[model samples]
Target: NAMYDGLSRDEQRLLNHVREYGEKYFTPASISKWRKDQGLPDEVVKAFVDLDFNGFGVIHRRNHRTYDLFAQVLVIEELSRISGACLPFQNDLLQLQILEAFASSAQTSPFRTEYQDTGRLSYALAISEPEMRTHVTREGDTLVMNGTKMFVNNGEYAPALLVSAYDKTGDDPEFSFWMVPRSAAGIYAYPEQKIGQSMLPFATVRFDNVEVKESWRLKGSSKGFSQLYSLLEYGRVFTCAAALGEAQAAMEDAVAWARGREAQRIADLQQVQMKLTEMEVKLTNMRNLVYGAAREYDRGEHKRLSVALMKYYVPKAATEVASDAMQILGGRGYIQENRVSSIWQDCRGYQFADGTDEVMVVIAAPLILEQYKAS
Candidate 1:
């Protein structure tokens, strides 16, 4: 609660609103059901969208008033505590953020307004691929797209795909994005099952000669790959924000379990106390890194090294905290029905989300090298 000291009144109010929403709706019984059902139902997503905690409209207005990175991070932390399964809603918000940041205001304003109006999960980012296949070609006023995107979260149901591909028609091909409608002909999405975050759908999306108007393009200058690259810091930090929330929940669950009657109060056990101590320490570390990176972003100095280190450390630490919490809970924690189990699974997935653990080092090491250079 003291953390609100760092946030504006509006940000604090938004955080509290999301917390109330989560507590009221995402009950233990409901989360258990969501896992079994393999996804959050449409109504649940709609309800969250209506909250519009960090909606595009907020982002646009905030852009003029100045967007609040810390506020957005805090909102993600609260919602993720309820369930990382809310990927569909989060994914759509993230896509909109990117569009607003990079694309023409003339193009993105209408798109943002449309999403704000409909409260629909409009775009599933279709970026990852195994190389060779996904490419778009300019044909006069039209564009032809073809390729398969791997591990597209929310692809199964999102209305459109925010696809990244090379423009091969020009002699100098470059990476660019196309907002291809899912309902468009020749676009196929096959849902893929995963170990964690099961309440969200992941799919392999194929574009077979899909054609669209040139207006759908989101090419952020000639250095298209760098445009995609620039977005990673924001994405990485938010991913860790979710990790922070899940780890907090897991630690809380473990402590409550330890204090509750179970053969004896495990809270008194030395080994159990050790795990609790470690979880708290690690959770504190994760919080510090997440907040540090978020604050830097808000300052308009999104230090790459700091963001990279935070991304690298927080999720990995979160997984450790969740794992320890599971150990403290014993067999119950191993069960699929337990909250700690779900927390562990979700934190594990975060390691690979915005960037891989190894990729974080790739971003950080050179920055580290430059920092200590002898001038």
Candidate 2:
């Protein structure tokens, strides 16, 4: 609490609201227990819908908006401490922004109206393909899609899938996005079993000659790849925020456990104290990196190099912090009941979620070289 005293009163209140929302609907024990087998439960969906996916001012409201990127990052970080299932609330927000940024006014108005009225939508972003095998082709006034998109988050439950596909029928192949209805005849979604984030639905979605009218295409932007590339840079910061929350939760749980243990309490052990200290240091570093990135973005500045470094460092550090928390708890942390174990698995997935840790260097190395070059 003392650490966050520097945050504005509004920001602090927003976090308290999010934490209260989580406490009212769920607990860490219930999250670890039920989410694994149930996959996004009705109650989980209800909880997020009740929050209106904005955390009551942590993010932009649909009709009215706030560009407080710092608060957006902070909200996700807090929600990650609550449950991974809740993080998918962001899927709707991210995909909605794409529509606003690139879709025609005629196409965007209906969805905008609906989201503003109800603050909820059943949609998943289906943008990545396995080995670049998925593609689309022109067919008269319609487009035919035929390919498999891998790891579509919340794909199974979503009524609509927002897809990015390469058009191979034209003289020069080009990338474009489309709104593909899941109810379409040839579309199928098969669930994926993942080691972490078990509560979130992932699917291998196949579009077998799925046809849609030309109106479904997002035609406002011809540079689809560039749009996706830029959004992903921002998305990585959200990923880091989530991981930071999970790591902070792990640190809290580990410390609580250590302080209460009988006989030689681990809190007094020098080795345990050192491990705890290291975890705190890592968490502080992650918080600074994520906050700085969000702050810079809100100022209308995109620090590509800082974003890359933060993406590369924060998740890995979060994972290490969780790992240390588990070590502190011994066997208790290894089990499912404790938050640290589940947090560990969830944090590890960040290494590859938005972009792999290795790819971060690819982004940063060139930028670093450019920055250091002669004036």
Candidate 3:
């Protein structure tokens, strides 16, 4: 498939390694055991950290720029394949991206080794708040972050957090970003019970009387919104890559199930054949769009509108692909033990992760109107 062909040799090898590790370690049964126990075992964390660093570790390298980006996409894709096993790794990746973009040598020096070598650091971006969904400028820092973050990836487990707060002094730029250590006195996370992606933990985090240090600021005084938007442009493309991986896995699973099972005799039925054919077509289309965006991002196109569109489309397509796979698998698909069920859970979470579908459309709308306005 063109999808697999697009990957470099190193990338393919990394993907294969992650696939095997995920199948064995991140299985439905394993996740259920952890959930039933009220938390994941220490062994699970050790295994994940080991696989994460060894198999897909290059992305966290401080100086290896090209390899880092390649590894970043590989990690995202591999995580999606295994029902988002690497979702927690995002905080660390985001921290790396932010530091590389905005932090000075002095500010980022202490954490660089921790970020790349130790693999012990995890981070959460506290950008989306109760009042501010897309309008980041409206909220005020002086208001104190009493409201909660709706859905935070690794909210309960990450040791560090990157927060976007409205600078009360709107005199400069109205927003600023800060780094909050998890051990800080005022930070707490309340877990949310979700429908599908329960294996992946999410929660609403609240900060009270959280003191900020001058050195921990992102992008200087009050310029956080513009800087963050720039970062999110790349983030959207990376997320699409993740969605593509999940969708690819779903397609593979569906094809395998159809051919092997005698339930519907899917391989012999014309309707099932048509469904598989359509799945392939959709998968190809989504892959083309995702990689095209990635290429443009690398080339410095920074087409916010294009990224927003893919952000909206890819996850939606992935969800549908996963759902279709489950249908094809029949009763087996509905069970928690099935990989397809995990994909279904993970893909559904993407709809709300970076931004909601409605918010993405709103972001694209202004760009679209502005283009026509000038012409």
Candidate 4:
């Protein structure tokens, strides 16, 4: 009942659609088979394509809004409920955001047909190099991009990639963004097998003397850092929403498991009941923070602190909820086949992905202090 008022009718319908599809097509068994096979299944990809990949297309068309944000969050949650389902969707969504922000009419026009019809496109952002951290300005245009990019999600399979590079002579920003087709020369990808979310392929991508044209550049010129930061802000809000969904899924599993176990009778235990109550409260808080930040984004309020706070807080809440679920489920949680175990692994991965929890806090803290001083 509480969920009903928070989302629009269309949003709720889309959430239900993703949940049903995920349970039926992207279940643990299905994901395991895909992983063991070492590639994504045509049928699995087709299923998502048929659904237009669940409102992400619509969200891109509508831009930022409460309903769109909620729908995006719901899609992430439903996909994460099943292993390996979220990353492909996320990669595609991130690509859409970058295209919306920077791509020329010609570069983005081709996607109108594909997004409207198939929704099967996946993308990777080549921002972090092997030598550089997140600084896009330091690595000049002549740097040659000889090193590799580690842990690139959807790198091996994505049809398109958005690369951020340095332009030595271009003004104060000195960074450039480009959209490179996967078939382009001098680009190579090697897959890496990971413990969790292996259903989503991760790879190390190397660009050896990769030649890119000026027409492919995002926003043109060298002031690409400004555009990139805006994209990351939007991305951080979505990340917060995804983490909120993860927390809900973990708590739901814990509650269901607690109710059924006779020996522990966790639902009957006062301590367990208190923990569940606290989890619900935390979940509500996290969702409010996420939605509030989304509202701010829609209003064109680029308060970096708000985005950073949501990014920092939501993942930590999710990690705690997932860890507590494992503790409540006991040995069953450790079993590979169990759903709780899957959620645990996925939540662990979230802590490191996007932006590390520590980095988010560091980014938020100084900004918050500066705001306070200014006030």
Candidate 5:
């Protein structure tokens, strides 16, 4: 704890985030409601919106924020200390990154103006799929979108969602992006239930030949996805931070159980002590890799391999720690309807969220191989 003085400016900010926002407001019942309900209640949504979490969605206030990934990383770690309140807002942070990176003034100005004019703003990103699903065709000066995107986090609430699409009409293999407004014809963001993180729900978004003019398309949206790769990489960083938070949450409770709870004192039990030790080691190892990736990202160094390593290991660490915590707490952990169980479920979801472990490993191996080959 003496090392608290050595934390970076953002770590201190995140420490405050845990105490100020996490402790004061985000209690077990409040956050679990979003999980149990599988999404936020209307009033709860409004309460968070009022906090100006959407400040960057409609407007890019920090243009010089390419290296600003750590702030969100720290912010998410603290918020996840509570529960899934970490998510819906998190997806928007990535959207803000996307807007700052690619959205034109013509697109952003009016969007921000609309938010400023009316106290209403929300955003989501839809990149995951149950299977490969994309059917976009060019029709005159417009594009027609088809197929469905599953497991889209925060799709249920956000009025506008940034989506990936494949241009079916193009002779060559062409892909693009679109901002599907809530009012868009044939575009639907139906709320979907999840096992955990009901507070921060994902959804099934379907586009039934949804047609859009050029204006709705992001700048260079007709091009390949190479342009947006950076945005996606940083998004993984935020995702890992949340995983890191939940893992830490699991360990914190494990330590508490060890030091305080037990027939005697579990801390005295060598097995219990070993589990706690493993959890700390794994969580700390993940913490280093995650912060390392974020630092490399800020340095403008090639971090594809580093982030991919984080993506692979962070989820495993979270799940392992939570599983061990359940074991440490024994039947009380399972029988009790408490946050640790929710955290274990949250950790399990991380295995699939962002990218699957297999995919992350696959990408990391080749990236590392290619880097060494060149070296």
Candidate 6:
């Protein structure tokens, strides 16, 4: 049974729908074309909307004071398994938290409602800064933005983005969030060449005096750290599942290779069996950590230290698992079409993608440093 067999039939149904839809379109030929073109054909993305899988990870239903966090995680897991294809929905998944948390009613309520009725609306999160170097200044009523953000996924496609900037408008050296529209003058994006993950162009996005109304701020001119810390916590819980999807793909490839590899039955080798056993244990550990974190988030409470541990551990485990799977496949793992090769490349990005392991440890050590506090 799958680790998530405990999911309700309805939850399983949602995930199976995405999985069924994604596997059909993510064939090797399709991925090769997407990589060559530097993004998926728009029809594939529209097909996901057609499949009703577009809003899978975003938290829209929680307002009823009810929601399942694991369902969100499971959806991310399933979609990510064929990420170069379907998780292009990732561009939308990127900014969902800020919109859910603090975007203006005009941007949130009406836009989301219209999204269901019309084939329109795309979102992106432009949070990383060249060095927290992106700056915004409030000149009277308009906010003028200046600086650059690199390696933004879907930077060109999404119409709007939730951007983080150092608020030069204020007295303090603090970072703040704002939603900026793509059409605004001075906003520029150019495609970035990357080693992998071309389903959406990783681009350099820059703002040179890009101006917007006061309505863009997460708060009425408020600037601080905690504004986004909660959202980041929630984001990692699902993103870690995305990495787990890559790890799972690697394991699946290992299994197929062990069984079908002709020169020798890799499964019959004791060393290969030991490695497979290691992969299984690590994969189960990842499932438990991700699901446990999701359940914790659903409880509407935050455990900083524990969540940080999960953010660090899950990706590290995923990278290790991928490395083992690659080893088992030997040279076959290097071939571009083998898919595990792609997944292997994708898995390592999670280590430093959102929160580096060092960053996670930096935050977590304080929770464990009771001795220092006492001393």
Off by over 4 Å in 3: 6-71, 82-86, 132-147, 169-173, 213-222, 369-375
Better by TM-score, candidate 5 or 2: 2
Q: What is the C-alpha RMSD of each candidate to the true structure, in Å?
A: 3.0, 3.0, 4.7, 4.2, 3.8, 3.6
How big is the RMSD of model 1? 3.0
What is the Cα-based TM-score of model 3? 0.79
lDDT of 3 by residue, 1-375 (tens): 446677777668777777776677666577666545544555544455466444444454435443355456666667666653325445446656665566566666667665444554456666666665321222344333334565676688777777766655344435656666878777889988776555456778887666555555665422556777777666666667777787878888888888887855777888778778887777777777776766665555657887788888888888888888888888877887676777777778778767879999999999999889989
TM-score for candidate 2: 0.89
What is candidate 5's TM-score against the reference? 0.85
Overall lDDT per candidate, in order of appearance: 0.76, 0.77, 0.66, 0.67, 0.70, 0.72
Candidate 4, residue 32: Cα displacement in angstroms equals 3.8
The residue-by-residue lDDT of candidate 6 on 1-375, one tens digit each, is: 246567767766787788887788777687777767766666665665566534443435645533456777787787676653225554454354456565555557765664554424565677777667888887777779988887777787778767878877876556677778899999899877656565556778989899976677766322366767776676687668888887887898888889998546879999999999999998888888888888776777657776788888998898898888888899866887777777767777677666899999888898879636878
Q: Could you tell me every candidate's TM-score relative to the true structure?
A: 0.89, 0.89, 0.79, 0.82, 0.85, 0.85
Which candidate's TM-score is highest? 2
In order of lDDT, best first, we have: 2, 1, 6, 5, 4, 3
Better of 4 and 5 by TM-score: 5
lDDT of 1 by residue, 81-152 (tens): 766343444566577777765577776767777666665546778888865458888667667888999889
Cα lDDT tens digits for candidate 4, 25-109: 7666776677567555666656665774344543355544323554566677667655432345665676666666666666666
Segments of candidate 2 deviating more than 4 angstroms: 37-66, 84-86, 116-119, 139-142, 168-172
TM-score-wise, the better of 2 and 3 is 2
Show pairs that collide, candidate 1.
Answer: none
lDDT of 4: 0.67
Worst 10 residues of 3 by lDDT: 133-142
